Amino acid sequence: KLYKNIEIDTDTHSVYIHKILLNLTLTEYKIISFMIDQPHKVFTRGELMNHCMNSDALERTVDSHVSKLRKKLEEQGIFQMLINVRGVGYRLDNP
Amino acid sequence: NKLYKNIEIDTDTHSVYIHSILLNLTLTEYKIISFMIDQPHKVFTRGELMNHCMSDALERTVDSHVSKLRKKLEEQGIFQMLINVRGVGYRLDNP
Amino acid sequence: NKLYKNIETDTHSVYILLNLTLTEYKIISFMIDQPHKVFTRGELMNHCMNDSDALERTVDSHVSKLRKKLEEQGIFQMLINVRGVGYRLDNPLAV
Amino acid sequence: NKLYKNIEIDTDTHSVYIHENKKILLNLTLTEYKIISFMIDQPHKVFTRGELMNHCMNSDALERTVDSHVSKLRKKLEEQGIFQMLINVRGVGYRLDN
Amino acid sequence: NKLYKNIEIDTDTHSVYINKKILLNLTLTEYKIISFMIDQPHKVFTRGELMNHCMNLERTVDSHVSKLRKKLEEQGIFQMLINVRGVGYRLDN
Amino acid sequence: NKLYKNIEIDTDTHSVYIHSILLNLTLTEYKISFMIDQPHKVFTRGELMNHCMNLERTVDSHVSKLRKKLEEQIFQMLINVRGVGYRLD
DNA sequence: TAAAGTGTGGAGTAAGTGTGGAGA
DNA sequence: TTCTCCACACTTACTCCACACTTTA
DNA sequence: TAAAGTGTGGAGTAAGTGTGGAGA
DNA sequence: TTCTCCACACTTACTCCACACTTTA
């Protein structure tokens, strides 16, 4: 499963940058693997929470998981991914 | 589009299908199955199911909604779904 | 001309010709695009009414008045309410 | 995707495009997105300021503030060569193209 | 430190930068193209010149230029890498 | 690529391989790359801290967690030298 | 055996229907 | 006026809880 | 000419980011 | 512990309103 220099091997559970392997947490893996299906879609915090976490936690906690993932992407020279869409949620890539 | 192992949920029509047939689900029952199919293997607590799929009523009332859904699944030949995880809550499917 | 199961655009006619109000015409013409979709009251209000600031219950009354007109031409079980969500033009089959 | 006369709104991405023969993406604010997405349902309908406020702002603010949101949206439409949209209907409110 | 109209190429680091100051993820071929053409921005380079200078049938040349162009457009830089029909390409009019 | 007795480190990809498998190392854990230069040398906790970790038990814990990842596959590799530090051997 | 979960069944009440009527 | 909207009571059926049976450590 | 609408600009404030740290 | 979540301050940019100009009957 591939999108613009980000490869996810689902079996078993590795995410590569074009190949550098990332050290992702389980939550972080779920986020990137969920959003890469529809890269340009805006996912709400509620959707990311239900699909990638665990509560039942705060919506701000979603933001922090996305931040931590983003930092890991930037340290492999991938910037302008995980863009926030103010008041709605997040998007993997904008057209 | 939501699909998982012979259970299809069309979110636009509010329909849930079994492959082999449309189920007559209540709104609460629809929310439960649509919530849990996001993370099939995850154990959801009664508190999570209550806040997402139902008042701050009793936790036992969650059990009854899950039971009624389970029965409807079993009458379409689906038995190994909605497993209770003792003292925590419920899981859609074991890994 | 939009056709769906015994219910038949430039003329503003719905067919045997029905005497529909403008609101009523908009409702039936809006919902026939996606017959089996559940439309919320908010969607019907924004698309088919004046006073988007009106009550959601007023949507129900427009649908009722349309339904009555459909039933007097021998069309029953059509504008089905989906409790807590909204309305649907027709239920899907269990096939 | 909501379409009306050279204005496309993709609701999943939250994107609004202008179409000759390429799609230009607009940089709308959330309020601005709600306005255009609300009014495109009934293009020819006159929406009052009260309707736009309740549906697109989320405030108890002044009605003149609605005008400013519509203005800012209009300017963004005009810079993509779209002039005949967002017509004011004096004393009532606003309408998408006549 | 080659500069031209909002495009900076640092030749020592092999970095190209584009509202400060976004680094582009260019391939080696792509780097050579942009670094070659920025010397004479307005010059029309032939496909033969770009091939000999930047690429170590014709659709492949065009494809390298396309992929570079897309990377420029995602940083809000459009109407760069203009094709001159039957000859080749130009960085800017 | 840095090689030593069935442990390969590719420095360009930041990957560490076991011969027989890619390891899922943290950045701190990757910084195995320091000790493989002088496999038999005893590195102090102070040296490992300054070079790899951008009280004393915390250094030990990083080394332990690396060791466990080696053992899940390679045993007897990150030998502790009591009170002083660690050796790859 | 306690501890916890399942499942049928019914009372209350949430939610929707539709007649009627006031305002433009 | 008609049509749109709202009001008021009618009407429907789902949600919740009860009580007993069954399963699990 | 009144009346109403447009549009630039600025003050306050939502909303998002990311470091840091407590709990399992 | 690590990871998950939450808190706090930093930072960004959108909303709202003001004030004057412009447009319409």
Q: Which of A39, A36, A35, A37 is nearest to A47 (CA)?
A: A35
Which residue of chain A comes nearest to B49, CA vs CA? A56
Protein contacts of strand I with Cβ less than 7 Å away: A 60, 63-64, 66-68, 70-71, 82, 84, 86-90; D 64, 67-68, 70-72, 74-75, 86, 88, 90-94
Chain F residues with CB under 8 Å of A9 CB are: none
Question: Do C19 and C69 contact (CB within 8 A), yes or no?
Answer: yes
Question: Do E27 and E19 contact (CB within 8 A), yes or no?
Answer: no
Q: In 3-state terms, what secondary structure has residue C95?
A: coil
Token pair, residue C16, equals 């045997």
Chain A residues with CB under 8 Å of F13 CB are: 19-21
CA distance A25 to chain B (A): 16
CA distance B34 to chain A (A): 10
Which position has the token pair 């409110």?
A: D93
Nearest nt by C1' to C53 Cα: H5
* D83 CB-near residues (< 8 Å, 6+ apart): D77
Which position has the token pair 């680094």?
A: E23
The residue type found at E74 is: E
Q: How many residues does chain D have?
A: 98
Nearest nt by C1' to B57 Cα: H16
Question: Do B26 and B33 contact (CB within 8 A), yes or no?
Answer: no
CA distance E75 to chain A (A): 10
Q: Which of D45, D1, D47 is nearest to D23 (CA)?
A: D1
CB-nearest partner of A41 from D13, D25, D30: D13
Q: How far is CA A42 from CA A46, C62, D2, D10, D11, in A?
A: 12, 34, 17, 11, 9
The reply to whether B87 has its C-beta less than 7 Å from any atom of strand H is: no
Give partners of F (≥3 CB pairs < 8 A). Answer: A
Which position has the token pair 């993932």?
A: A69
Question: Do D14 and D52 contact (CB within 8 A), yes or no?
Answer: no
DSSP code string of A29-84: HHHHHHHTTSTTSEEEHHHHHHHH------HHHHHHHHHHHHHHHHTTT--S-SEE
Which position has the token pair 């091997």?
A: A9
Give the bridge partners for B18, in sequence order: B7
Give the bridge partners for F86, in sequence order: F43, F80
Q: Which of F83, F89, F73 is nearest to F36 (CA)?
A: F89
Q: How many residues does chain F have?
A: 89
DSSP code string of F51-87: HH---HHHHHHHHHHHHHHHHT---S-SEEETTTEEE
- Report the 10 Å Cβ neighbour count for B77: 10
The residue type found at E40 is: Q
D20 burial class (0-12, 13-18, 19+ CB within 10 angstroms)?
Answer: exposed
Distance CA A55, CA B44 (A): 9
Estimate to the nearest angstrom the gap between the alpha carbon of D89 and the chain centroid: 15
Phi, psi of C12 (to 5 degrees): 65, 30
* D93 CB-near residues (< 8 Å, 6+ apart): D46, D47, D48, D49, D51, D52
Residues 1-30 of chain A: which lie with beta carbon within 7 Å of strand J? 23, 25-28
Nearest nt by C1' to C61 Cα: G18
* A64 CB-near residues (< 8 Å, 6+ apart): none
Chain B residues with CB under 8 Å of C86 CB are: none
The answer to whether E23 contacts A80, with C-beta atoms less than 8 Å apart, is: no
The reply to whether C58 has its C-beta less than 7 Å from any atom of strand H is: yes
Phi, psi of C85 (to 5 degrees): -120, -55
The answer to whether D14 contacts A88, with C-beta atoms less than 8 Å apart, is: yes
Q: Using the structure, give the distance in angstroms from the CA atom of A76 to the C1' atom of H13, rounded to a whole number.
A: 58
Which bases along strand G come within 7 Å of a protein CB atom?
4-9, 15-20
Nearest nt by C1' to C84 Cα: G15
DSSP F3: E
Chain D residues with CB under 8 Å of C47 CB are: 41-42
Cα radius of gyration rounded to whole Å, chain F: 12
For an interface test with B, the pick among A29, A50, A54, A58 (most B C-beta atoms closer than 10 Å) comes out as A50
The residue type found at B17 is: Y
Distance CA E66, CA B17 (A): 45
The answer to whether D12 contacts A38, with C-beta atoms less than 8 Å apart, is: yes
Q: Which of F36, F33, F17, F28 is nearest to F60 (CA)?
A: F28
Q: Which of A63, A60, A68, A57 is nearest to A28 (CA)?
A: A68
Question: Do B72 and B23 contact (CB within 8 A), yes or no?
Answer: yes
The answer to whether B39 contacts A55, with C-beta atoms less than 8 Å apart, is: no
* Experimental determination approach used: X-ray
The answer to whether D51 contacts C53, with C-beta atoms less than 8 Å apart, is: yes
The residue type found at D83 is: F
Cα radius of gyration rounded to whole Å, chain E: 12
Residue nearest to nucleotide I14 (CA to C1'): A87
Residue nearest to nucleotide H2 (CA to C1'): C21
Q: How far is CA F33 from CA B68, D98, E62, F7, F36, in A?
A: 58, 70, 42, 10, 5
DSSP D84: S
The residue type found at B84 is: N
The residue type found at C53 is: D
Residue nearest to nucleotide G14 (CA to C1'): C84
Q: To 10 degrees, what angle do helices F45-52 and F56-71 make?
A: 80
Distance CA A5, CA A80 (A): 13
Token pair, residue F13, equals 């990809």
Phi, psi of C50 (to 5 degrees): -85, 180
Evaluate the CA torsion angle E68, E74, E76, E78 in order and state its sign.
positive
Chain A residues with CB under 8 Å of E74 CB are: 80
Please give the helix or strand (H or E) that residue C19 lies within, else none. Answer: none
Q: How far is CA E21 from CA E6, E8, E14, E18, E75, in A?
A: 9, 9, 15, 5, 10
Exposure string for D61-75, b = 16+ CB within 10 A, e = fewer: eeeeebeebbeebbe
E to F contact (≥3 Cβ pairs closer than 8 Å) = no
Exposure string for A34-71, b = 16+ CB within 10 A, e = fewer: bbbeebebbbebebbbbbbbeeeeeeeebeebbeebbe
Resolution of the coordinates in A? Answer: 2.8
Give partners of A (≥3 CB pairs < 8 A). Answer: B, D, E, F
- Report the 10 Å Cβ neighbour count for F55: 6
Token pair, residue B67, equals 């039971």
Chain D residues with CB under 8 Å of A85 CB are: 14
Query: Could you give the angle at the alpha carbon of E14 between the alpha carbons of E13 and E20, nearest 5°?
Result: 80
The residue type found at F43 is: F
Question: Do A8 and A14 contact (CB within 8 A), yes or no?
Answer: yes
DSSP E22: P
The answer to whether C46 contacts D41, with C-beta atoms less than 8 Å apart, is: yes
The answer to whether B35 contacts A50, with C-beta atoms less than 8 Å apart, is: yes
